[PDB]
Structures are given as C-alpha cells and as structure tokens.
Amino acid sequence: RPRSNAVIRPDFKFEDLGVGGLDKEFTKIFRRAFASRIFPPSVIEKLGISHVKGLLLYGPPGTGKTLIARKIGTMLNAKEPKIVNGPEILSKYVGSSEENIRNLFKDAEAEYRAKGEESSLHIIIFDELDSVFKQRGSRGDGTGVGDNVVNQLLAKMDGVDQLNNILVIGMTNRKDLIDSALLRPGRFEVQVEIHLPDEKGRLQIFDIQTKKMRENNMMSDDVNLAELAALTKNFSGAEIEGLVKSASSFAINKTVNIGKGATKLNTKDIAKLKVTREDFLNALNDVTPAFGISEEDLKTCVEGGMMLYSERVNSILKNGARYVRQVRESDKSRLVSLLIHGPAGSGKTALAAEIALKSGFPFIRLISPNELSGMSESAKIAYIDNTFRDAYKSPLNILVIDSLETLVDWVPIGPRFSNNILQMLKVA
Amino acid sequence: LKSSNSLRPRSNAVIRPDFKFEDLGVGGLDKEFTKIFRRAFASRIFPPSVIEKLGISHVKGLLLYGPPGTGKTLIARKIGTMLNAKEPKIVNGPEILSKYVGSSEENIRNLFKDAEAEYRAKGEESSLHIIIFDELDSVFKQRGSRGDGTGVGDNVVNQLLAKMDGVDQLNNILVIGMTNRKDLIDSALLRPGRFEVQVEIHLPDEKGRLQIFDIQT
Amino acid sequence: AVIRPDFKFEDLGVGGLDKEFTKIFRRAFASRIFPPSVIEKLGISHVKGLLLYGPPGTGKTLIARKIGTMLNAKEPKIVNGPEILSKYVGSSEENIRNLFKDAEAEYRAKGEESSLHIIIFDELDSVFKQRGSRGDGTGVGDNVVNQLLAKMDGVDQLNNILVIGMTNRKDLIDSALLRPGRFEVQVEIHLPDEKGRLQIFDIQTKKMRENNMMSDDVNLAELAALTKNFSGAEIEGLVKSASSFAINKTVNIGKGATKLNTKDIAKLKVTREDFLNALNDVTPAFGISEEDLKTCVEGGMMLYSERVNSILKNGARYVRQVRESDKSRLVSLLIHGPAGSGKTALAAEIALKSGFPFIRLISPNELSGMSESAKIAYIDNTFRDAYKSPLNILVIDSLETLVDWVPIGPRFSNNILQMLKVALKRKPPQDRRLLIMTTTSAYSVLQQMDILSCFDNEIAVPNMTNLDELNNVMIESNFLDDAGRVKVINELSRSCPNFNVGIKKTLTNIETARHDPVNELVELMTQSA
Amino acid sequence: DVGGQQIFSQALLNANRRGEAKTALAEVQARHQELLKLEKSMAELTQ
Numbered sequence A: 001r002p003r004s005n006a007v008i009r010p011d012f013k014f015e016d017l018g019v020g021g022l023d024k025e026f027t028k029i030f031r032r033a034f035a036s037r038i039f040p041p042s043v044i045e046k047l048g049i050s051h052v053k054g055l056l057l058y059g060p061p062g063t064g065k066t067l068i069a070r071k072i073g074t075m076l077n078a079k080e081p082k083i084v085n086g087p088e089i090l091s092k093y094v095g096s097s098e099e100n101i102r103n104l105f106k107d108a109e110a111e112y113r114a115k116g117e118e119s120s121l122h123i124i125i126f127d128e129l130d131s132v133f134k135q136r137g138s139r140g141d142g143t144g145v146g147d148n149v150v151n152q153l154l155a156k157m158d159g160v161d162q163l164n165n166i167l168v169i170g171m172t173n174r175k176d177l178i179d180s181a182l183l184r185p186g187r188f189e190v191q192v193e194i195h196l197p198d199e200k201g202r203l204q205i206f207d208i209q210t211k212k213m214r215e216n217n218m219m220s221d222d223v224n225l226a227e228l229a230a231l232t233k234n235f236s237g238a239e240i241e242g243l244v245k246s247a248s249s250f251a252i253n254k255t256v257n258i259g260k261g262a263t264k265l266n267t268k269d270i271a272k273l274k275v276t277r278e279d280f281l282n283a284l285n286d287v288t289p290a291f292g293i294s295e296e297d298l299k300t301c302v303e304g305g306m307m308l309y310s311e312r313v314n315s316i317l318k319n320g321a322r323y324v325r326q327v328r329e330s331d332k333s334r335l336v337s338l339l340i341h342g343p344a345g346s347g348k349t350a351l352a353a354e355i356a357l358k359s360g361f362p363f364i365r366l367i368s369p370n371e372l373s374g375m376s377e378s379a380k381i382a383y384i385d386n387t388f389r390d391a392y393k394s395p396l397n398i399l400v401i402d403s404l405e406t407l408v409d410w411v412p413i414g415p416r417f418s419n420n421i422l423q424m425l426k427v428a
Numbered sequence B: 001l002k003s004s005n006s007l008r009p010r011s012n013a014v015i016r017p018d019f020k021f022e023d024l025g026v027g028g029l030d031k032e033f034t035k036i037f038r039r040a041f042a043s044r045i046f047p048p049s050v051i052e053k054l055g056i057s058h059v060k061g062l063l064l065y066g067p068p069g070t071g072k073t074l075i076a077r078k079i080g081t082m083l084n085a086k087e088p089k090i091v092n093g094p095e096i097l098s099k100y101v102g103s104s105e106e107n108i109r110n111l112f113k114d115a116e117a118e119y120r121a122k123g124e125e126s127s128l129h130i131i132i133f134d135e136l137d138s139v140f141k142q143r144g145s146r147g148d149g150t151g152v153g154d155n156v157v158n159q160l161l162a163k164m165d166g167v168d169q170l171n172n173i174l175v176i177g178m179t180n181r182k183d184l185i186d187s188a189l190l191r192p193g194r195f196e197v198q199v200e201i202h203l204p205d206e207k208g209r210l211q212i213f214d215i216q217t
Numbered sequence C: 001a002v003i004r005p006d007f008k009f010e011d012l013g014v015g016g017l018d019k020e021f022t023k024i025f026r027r028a029f030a031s032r033i034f035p036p037s038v039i040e041k042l043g044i045s046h047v048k049g050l051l052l053y054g055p056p057g058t059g060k061t062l063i064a065r066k067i068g069t070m071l072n073a074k075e076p077k078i079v080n081g082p083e084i085l086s087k088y089v090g091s092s093e094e095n096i097r098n099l100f101k102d103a104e105a106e107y108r109a110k111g112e113e114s115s116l117h118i119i120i121f122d123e124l125d126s127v128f129k130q131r132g133s134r135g136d137g138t139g140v141g142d143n144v145v146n147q148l149l150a151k152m153d154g155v156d157q158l159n160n161i162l163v164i165g166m167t168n169r170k171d172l173i174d175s176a177l178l179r180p181g182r183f184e185v186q187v188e189i190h191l192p193d194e195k196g197r198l199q200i201f202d203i204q205t206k207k208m209r210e211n212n213m214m215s216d217d218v219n220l221a222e223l224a225a226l227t228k229n230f231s232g233a234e235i236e237g238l239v240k241s242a243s244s245f246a247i248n249k250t251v252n253i254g255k256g257a258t259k260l261n262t263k264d265i266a267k268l269k270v271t272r273e274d275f276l277n278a279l280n281d282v283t284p285a286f287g288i289s290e291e292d293l294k295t296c297v298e299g300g301m302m303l304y305s306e307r308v309n310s311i312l313k314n315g316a317r318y319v320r321q322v323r324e325s326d327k328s329r330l331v332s333l334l335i336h337g338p339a340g341s342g343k344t345a346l347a348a349e350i351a352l353k354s355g356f357p358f359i360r361l362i363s364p365n366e367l368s369g370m371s372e373s374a375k376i377a378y379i380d381n382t383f384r385d386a387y388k389s390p391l392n393i394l395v396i397d398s399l400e401t402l403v404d405w406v407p408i409g410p411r412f413s414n415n416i417l418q419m420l421k422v423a424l425k426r427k428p429p430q431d432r433r434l435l436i437m438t439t440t441s442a443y444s445v446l447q448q449m450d451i452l453s454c455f456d457n458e459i460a461v462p463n464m465t466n467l468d469e470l471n472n473v474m475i476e477s478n479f480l481d482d483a484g485r486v487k488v489i490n491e492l493s494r495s496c497p498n499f500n501v502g503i504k505k506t507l508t509n510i511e512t513a514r515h516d517p518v519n520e521l522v523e524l525m526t527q528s529a
Numbered sequence D: 001d002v003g004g005q006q007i008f009s010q011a012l013l014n015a016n017r018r019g020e021a022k023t024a025l026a027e028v029q030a031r032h033q034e035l036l037k038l039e040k041s042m043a044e045l046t047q
Ligand SMILES: Nc1ncnc2c1ncn2[C@@H]1O[C@H](COP(=O)(O)OP(=O)(O)OP(=O)(O)O)[C@@H](O)[C@H]1O
Pocket: A018, A019, A020, A021, A060, A061, A062, A063, A064, A065, A066, A067, A068, A173, A205, A208, A237, A238, A239, A241, B165, B188
C-alpha cells in the first residue's frame, strides 16, 4: 500500500490544477520527478536509485512559469515552501551572504538525521535564478561575492553529505547565463521550456479564465469562445486575462459613468450586469500582442487591395497555394525556396503577402529594409541571424524577404555592395 | 458603518461621487483622462460583491510618456493628492542606489512593506497605497545591454520584477511612472500585470491652447 | 601504519580510473611505506601537496569521500571553501591556523612516530584566488592566502601533513601556491574510455542485477557502445531515468486515480526499450562530432553506377595507406566536379567507413555569423585539436565558400586563404598521422589562385548521363509501379536521349512529381537538361 | 582607458565586540543568582 504521507495525494487530476495548456510538460515533470516518491520504500531501496532534487522552468515572459511553481508548492501536502526572491541573499557584512544560503538547508538536515527515510518533503523555490548565479569568472562587482555564493550552493546541493529529502524549484528567462556546473545531472536535472500556446491551449485558457463569470449567470448568451480563441492569434497566456479585465471594465463603465456624473449606480442598473460580445470586440482595440507585431506589417502591405484585372494573377496565386500545400503535406521536403522577379512597379510584395496571409501557418515573419534602417553592419547581421534562428521552433513556418537587392546596398556606380550580408544570406 | 440590504456604494470610496474633470486643473487632454479613469479607477467603486463574483483583480500599474514640458508630472501630482488614500512614497530618479554591497535592493524592497502588512492584517478593506517612480528610464534599462559595468543594472530590475508580480500576491497598490523615452525600459516591465496602461501625452491642439490659457489666467 | 592490511581496491566504487590511482599511490604514499630510517639515508623529502582537477562531474569528490575509509587513515578534516570566511576581524586567519594544532601537538610529542594527518579542502578556488586582484576594500581575502602559505611553507619542519585540493578550474588558483614545496603533484581526471564506461555501468547496475530486478534481455555492451561521451554522473542519470519508465507503467500519475497493481509490483522488471527511451531523454554536454557527418549522408547512397564503387575503393586504398605506412605522415586529397553532382556525401561515407578514432567536419554552416578573427581562431583551434590522436581524418567542405568568393570584384578574404594554404602542408608532431579530404566545385578558380600544388591527388565525380542510371534511381526511389517506370523511360528515350542533370535535382523532381504521370516528372526532367 | 571603473564596499565588525555572551548582559546568569537571592530574602522579610 502507499505510504502514510504520500505527497501527491491518492486522487489527483491535472484538471483541478487550474493551468490551461501544457498537457505534455506536466506528464514529463511528474514522471521524472514525483514518480518515485509514491512507491513502496522497499522496492525503491532494492532498485538502488536516488530521488531527483532539481527542477528548472524557462521561457519567454508571460507564459505561466510562476503559476506552476505556486501550485506545486501549495497542492502537494508538504511543508511550507521556502520562497526566496532573486537578490534577497546579499548582505553587507563579510561572510554573511554565504551564511544566508546555508541557513535554508538546516531543517532538512535536522530532520534527515533523526527520522531517516520517513521525513516529509522540504521544498524551496528560487525566484529569478539568473540574477546572482552567473558564470563565475567574470569581473562583475569588484568584491567577489557572487562567486562565493555560487560555490556555496554548488557545495550544498551535492557536497560530501547526503540529504535525499529536498527539492528546489527554479525560474528564469535567460538560461544561457547560469553557471555550467549547476546544470550537471545531480543538480537541476529536469529542465523544461514553457512556450506560447496553440489554438486549443487558447481555448482552454479562455475556458479557465471565464469560469466564475459564467457560473454566476454574469455572461451573455451571445459570446462564442471558439470565435474569440480564433481571433486572438498570437496572444500569450498573460494577455487573455488583460482582455477579460478590459471587457469587464467596458461593461462596468456603462453604469457608473465615471467623470460625467455619479449617483447613477442604482440597484436596477447593477442587478442585470451582463458582458456581451460587443464588449470583447471593443476590448480587442486596447490589448495588443507583443510577438505578433510583424503580421500587422504584412497586413498593411496589401492595403491598396487586390484586383484581378486578368487571369495570370489567378494562376500565380494558385501556384503559390499549391506550393503551400506541398510544403504542408510532405515529410522529406523540409525546405522550399521560391523567387519572384519582374519589372519594377509590378506589385510583387503585395502578391507575396497575399499568398502568405491566406496560408494560416502558425508562424509568419517578414524582413524588409525598413526594419534594418539606421543599424550598423554587425547589428544587421545579428538581427538577420536571430530572425532565422527564431524560425526553427514551430512545426510550420513562413519567412518573407523583401527587396534582396536593397538589403545589400547595391548601387551601380562602383559597383558597391556589402559582401558580408550577401554571404550570410547565401549561407542561410 | 454597515452595508445594508440595498446595494449602496462603498463606505470609504476612493473617487467619491462629487468629481468632474473640470476640477483637476489640467486642460487640453480630455480623452486620455477618460481612458485612464475608466481602465484604472472604475473597479474600485462598484460594490465588492459583484466585483468578487466576476473573479477579476485590479490593475496595478500606470505609465505616462511624452515630450519634455507637456504635463506628465502635473497629472501625477494631481492624482496623488486629490484622492482618499495613504500619502505617496515619492522617489526621484537615481535616489535608490547606495554604496554598500546589498543596500540598493533593500531600498527597493522597503517601499512595499506597509502595503504588505496592511493587506495581511485586514484583507480587501485595506486602503489604497500609492508610490510614484520619477524618471523611470534612469536605472531600469534593458538587461544584458552595454553599460552598467558594475553588476547593478540587473539586480535592481530583477528585484522590482520579482516584487511587483511574484509567488505572494498583493492587490492594494498602484504604481505610476513617467518618462520621455519608453524605448529603453525593460521588455518584461510592460506586460499585463506590470504597467498595463501606457499613455502618450502629446503637444496641445489649438483649442487645447485656448483651454490652457483659460486655466492659467 | 599507512594502508590497512585488509584492502585490495576491487571493492571500492571508483572504476574506470586505474592509472590515475596507481600514479597517486606511487607519488603520494610510497615514501611512507618503508621504515623511516631509509628515507633520510636516501636524502629524499616527503610530498606535501596534491591537486586534482577536471571537468564537472568526473568522480573526484567520490575519491575524496572514500579515500579516508579505504586506506586506514585518520578521519580527514573536510572544510568547504566559503565556510572559512567570517565577520569579525582576525577570525578567518585564526580559523585557518586552528586546523593544524593537532598535527603540531602530535609532531612535537612523538617525533617521527607521529601518524599521518590528512585534511582536504573542497572548492579550493573559492577563497584562494589571485592575491593581486585589487578592489580597494577589506583585505581578509588576501591575508587568508598569506596565513595558509605561512603555515605550509614556513612549516617549522612539519613533515607529517598532506593537503588535498579538489577544484574544477585550475586557472583561477593563485599562482603562488603552484610551485615546488606547495602542491607539487597535479593529477588531471578526464572523461572515461569505453572500458571504464563498461565498468561504471556494471557498478551502477550491480544491485539492480543482484535482486533479479533487471530483465535478462538487457545487454550492457550495447549500452556502453551507444553512450559515446557520457561521464559517470550522466550514466547514473540515464540509469534512473530508464528506471522511471518501468516505474510509470503500474503507477499512472495524473491520469485516473492511484491504481497500484500489487501483483505487478512483484514482477517489476526493466527492459531494453526503456533504456533506449532513456537514451532519448538524457543528452551529453560535450558532443564534438560523430553527428554532423551522419546527418550529412542522410539521403544515403544508391550505387547507381560503377563510378561510385571505384571512388569508394580508391578512398579505401588511401585510408589503408595512411593506416599502414609510418613514413607517410600526411596525405591530402581533392574532390572536384560539377555543381550538385554530390560530393560531401561521398567524403562523409568514406570517412565513416574508415572508422578512425578521430573524425570531424568543417563547414560554412558552423562558421556562419562569426567575425573574421573568430573564424581564424576557430580554424586554428580545430586543426590543433586534430593534431592530437594517433590517427585522424579531417574533411573540408566547399572550400570556395569558406573564402567568400564573389566574381564581381572579384572579392575574397586573403587571410583565410593564406592560413589554409599554410595549414594544408604542416606535418603533424612526431608519430601522428593525418588524412585531409577537401571538396570543391570551382576547380578553375582554385587554379587561378595557384594553390593547386598542395594537393597530392584529385578525384573527379562525373554526373550521370545514361537513362539506365535514371531507371536505377527511380526503382530505388519507388516512384511508380513497374509499368509506369518502364513507360517513362521509353518515352524519355525518344523525347530527349542525351542527358546531363546530376543527382540532387533528380530526387527533387521525383518528389515534386509524386506530390502533384509523365506530364510532370518528364516535363521537369527535360526542362532541366 | 580612464575613469572606467566604479567600486562597491563591504564592512567588518569590531574584534572587541567578538561573541554575544561577553558578560555585562550575558553574566545576567550570575546576576540572576544574585537577584534570586535577593528575592528569597525579600520573601522572608515580607513574611
Ligand atoms: N495556463 C496559463 N498560462 C499562463 N498564464 C496563465 C494561465 N492560466 C492563467 N494565467 C494567468 O496569466 C498569468 C501568467 O503570469 P505568471 O504569474 O505565471 O508569470 P510569468 O508568465 O512567469 O511571468 P514572468 O516571466 O514575467 O515572471 C497568471 O498570473 C494568471 O493570472
């Protein structure tokens, strides 16, 4: 039978956690981390293994990497979590910064010495890990405190004495600055990336956010959540909440009339509050994505409108659609490149943008001279490289390059042009 | 007092019912004021019951940006000293930095403690607290950029980020910031949950000039 | 005395590092085996300092932990580096000169009869950094080194102390302590070899095997072969990761409730596929190569004609020649042909078939985005690394692109070209061999640069022209049914008998035609030629 | 370079401060014994 205090409770479902999306990360996490603590101690002792004692969560801002830590800390029938904000360790007096990072493990050692392998899980969560624990060896402050803190943590996570009843959770936005020695197995083994959701994730998040509103008969019967999940294309997890708040503010402002005149707040007006669909559409003009800032530019390039003055236009569009279909359906053809050429002023960029917009791919991006204007050569190379490196994440991707000739600064007098950018593009 | 059966407005309201945009003394900007006073100070006037049945929290950030000499600091001053709340904890631009190894982050930590104490002690009836950051773009710059050779440009930003939205919640504060250049503030400080409402204040229109003239004289 | 009479080192956990153990034993405790009288008769002093260093996670702390119990030593005193420092003035230096009191007392009491006291400093580089760091502040980070140095150099004849210091970065250690009389011997611990890997795997799975918890299917030799660059810690992580899968078939976490099959609990058993999935999960942090070459030949071979076989045989002859002779310590080859014929694949195939210990590939993809100086440093470092192992193969891909050649100037980078020219002729250090294989597609341009004198031999790769080769690639690609494959070739025989295309374009056209009859594949094929 | 370096500063306590049980506040043990003696004698006197 299970243990007397088996941490993860007998009956527990991912549905009651309260986090939408990320239905695979949770599996991986629980399989690798908590699968070995709900098992008869004799068997695990026979297998001769040890429980993992690390966990790292990294990703872009707003994806929900602090909600998970909170819920894990609160829902696991363990001791109270030991939360530490990022730069809360440092202290003035010499030799007190290091002591503050070894006063966190004292109770675990105290219990592990007495009750052996029957102690309860102790959990401590580091917030904003990468602030202090940088790669030791640089010249950061001129005193040398960060290196000592790093050394103390290194010596306490594995060290020469065994603890085997502790767990530490980390969170960060930049995983390339953490000192290498921390990431070795035995310290922060499982590392998980939390990224932006898909359409089903968006639907789940929308369902989670607007739960009490619905069940208290406070939402109209007109709103269709599927339509809303379809309209918000690149919204992350932390902006749907902003959308709900904005819609509620819009619905509330129709009664109080803040500024024009008070006293309109009366039982009749507030006894039938109901957020309609128009409120959400109005709210869509206040909250704007932060990653979906390049689809708008593509949308502004075909502002003049498409007119089918002939039939060749239809043919080329059909060819582009055929190629889109081919790249979508194939398996071994993982890269297809096209060229579009013709006399100046014939409308090439608009046609390409039109093919791009009708694809419906998750990821669409555009590089044009306007973006790179005012930069230095190295900045341009770095920008292009980063944009190309950002296209290897999603399963399907579309990238549009505008006016190749002007990207390399071609002028026929010399001829003069930049060789480095040309070589970069040719390689890429 | 006690809340009777009739759903009557909060006892210690923030904005009160005797308010109109002609009393502030700021002329010109008129739509901006509507936006600001709907997005921020509209969820603190309705009775707590309905706002609790919607499951929404209040906005805890405000950013004002624009050219030099337009009216940002005037708005901040008027908002601070024409409400019913605790006194603002004003901080100038580089007034946080200290000489010792771990005194700057502590200075950023000491601003929130009264709000923490009163929220813990009472709950949803705690009075609103205000702290205003002036010249936000002085210390809070993009992380990992050139400059700040000493390791201070990163610790400060991390502390503020961790203290404005963290593992321990807090919803009785309002932080307001003013600047001339919003292209240098960190990118994680401008997401919903930290400085949601951002407003640009531009040069006045002709009728705006008339309104300002009538206000001054 | 100094080693327990009951000990053989077979029991102790550390495995895969045997030479290092013998070296340590010979150079550290050997002088303390005889009776003392001999040593003074021979005029040899005792060793005082030992230094261990290596990459993160190689087993040094394990050695430190088990040495005390294994070799009948006094309970070693273990102190973590940053624990020395303290607040009040003078406390730290006292703390350092408070560890040696027992040895001094015993020495004074019992002369040369005093036993051996050993103290080991974990994280040595934490406190004893360079003592010229500067900073204009509290000096407690300098007097610490001075105190230790005073008690280690001006020992006043303490000859019964051995300090062991374990670190991960030797460079950060203050240079003053790396000199005769202070940390003389330095032992490096590097990554294990394949046999040490097997030893580690055996040690890790001992208890698992003993209790009949491991299925007989599992084969440790295969696993040792698969783990190319895994250190010990990663092997342990792999073991427990594989065990997690077996655990997660009875206990279904999340899904449903806790359903524990009390009967399958007694039949718990690991198997091979679990280990393969575990290999999937865990990844090494060292890597180097042996993956880029494999992906470079992903499309595979087709043996569509005899030329492929002949070229491969010639490559085999050359690898044999470089393997056997001792006077031929350097061979370079050029592979040139029309664009798109397929060149990198052939070289990668030959290199993989060679099976030498060291293999690597340099391509513009890796170098992309770097500054010129970085590229130069990268190439130099890569060459220097290649000059290490007894046998080495190096492949250079698309030379013309590495030099940034554009025919409008003509513009190109002279520095890189000159470095490559000088490097391609440098014989390796004594008793090492190298085989360089470089591919190109612009033979004439190389002729113009006048670097054609540094290649011993050249190999051409003509593209296919007979329709029979097209039929072979078609049948190998399974494009169409047999009748269609016949019909297309009869039609193409009269549509355009003369043929010059390549290889890559053929596969591309085959796939595009598959996606969208003759009207497409043959149309494209005729259009290209 | 020139004027391209800043610096922080740390602080050590006093040696005279040393421990926390350094009499005049920690010798409240001995003094407490004096005070207990005082209390016992006063108890008798009040009786
Ligand atoms: N599945 C979800 N993913 C993300 N956010 C969610 C989700 N469900 C609800 N939310 C809401 O979005 C917010 C996400 O922000 P959170 O507190 O997790 O910080 P974060 O994304 O880690 O941000 P940062 O990196 O800036 O610290 C939560 O406060 C919550 O209100």
